[PDB]
Structure formats: C-alpha cells, structure tokens
Amino acid sequence: KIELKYKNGRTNVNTDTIYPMFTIVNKGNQKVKLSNIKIRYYYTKEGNASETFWCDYFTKGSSNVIGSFAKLNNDKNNANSYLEISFSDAAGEIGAGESVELSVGFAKNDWSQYNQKNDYSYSSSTTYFSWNKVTLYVSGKLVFGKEP
C-alpha cells in the first residue's frame, strides 16, 4: 500500500522549468524496493528538443534517482508527454511505515511560454497532498492515481 503526495516547488505557470516534489509513503506492512517503484508527471510539450532532468533532493541520495522522458502518442490537449522517475538498486527499500521525500526539476527546452495550467499534472499546491493526477507504479502495475 504505497501512496504518493505532491507539491509544487515553484508555481509560476509560463516557465520552461517545472519543479515537481513528491513524498512516497509506505502505508503497508511490507517493505518495497525502490527500484520497483516508478512515478509519472504528465505535461504538454511543443517542440522536439530533449528535456533536461535533475534531482535536487532525495532521502536515499540524489544520484540514485533516474529521470526519463516519454510520449503519450494520444493527441490530447491536457498532456502529450511525461516524466517517468525511477530508482537504482542502491536506493534500497522503503520500510513498512517509512517514507522518502524527492524534489526534482526538469526543463522542457521549449521556451514557448505555454500555460502550464493546461497540464494534467499541474497543481499550484505548496503543501504536499494526495494528488491523483500524478501516478505511481509498483513492479510496473498502477497502484496510485489516475492515468490521463
């Protein structure tokens, strides 16, 4: 029973950079290996340049957080792209009743002034909350949130 909380590290809506922050909470009785957990954040991208990902903070070491980018290939206006966050073997485990905190960022490399309020996963919250428009998978299976 793995839950995900979200807050926004910088709420400006027309910037090229986006600052998703998450807490991953193990609310079950069994430990989960972090290398089995993935998180997605969904947004619209205009242009063909590759995004840039970084990790500003992670309980288990920023070097153990992996950022990848992919397309939804669905022609919808709330998102066409996602950031997928994954974790290395060296990230270890989240014990039962423990949590980890993760503060990341990415640049779309559009420089377009797009309105991020149109993004499926955008929230202006500066409090970690139970936001169901970001998703969490365990061993590839969706366990938290709603896919677009």
Structure determination method: X-ray
Resolution in A: 1.6
CA contacts within 13 A on the Cβ side of 109: 8
Of 119, 142, 102, 145, the residue nearest 7 (C-alpha): 102
Amino acid at 121: S
The yes or no reply on domain 1-148 and CATH 2.60.40.710 is: yes
Of 21, 37, 26, 57, the residue nearest 131 (C-alpha): 21
102, 57 Cβ separation under 8 angstroms? yes
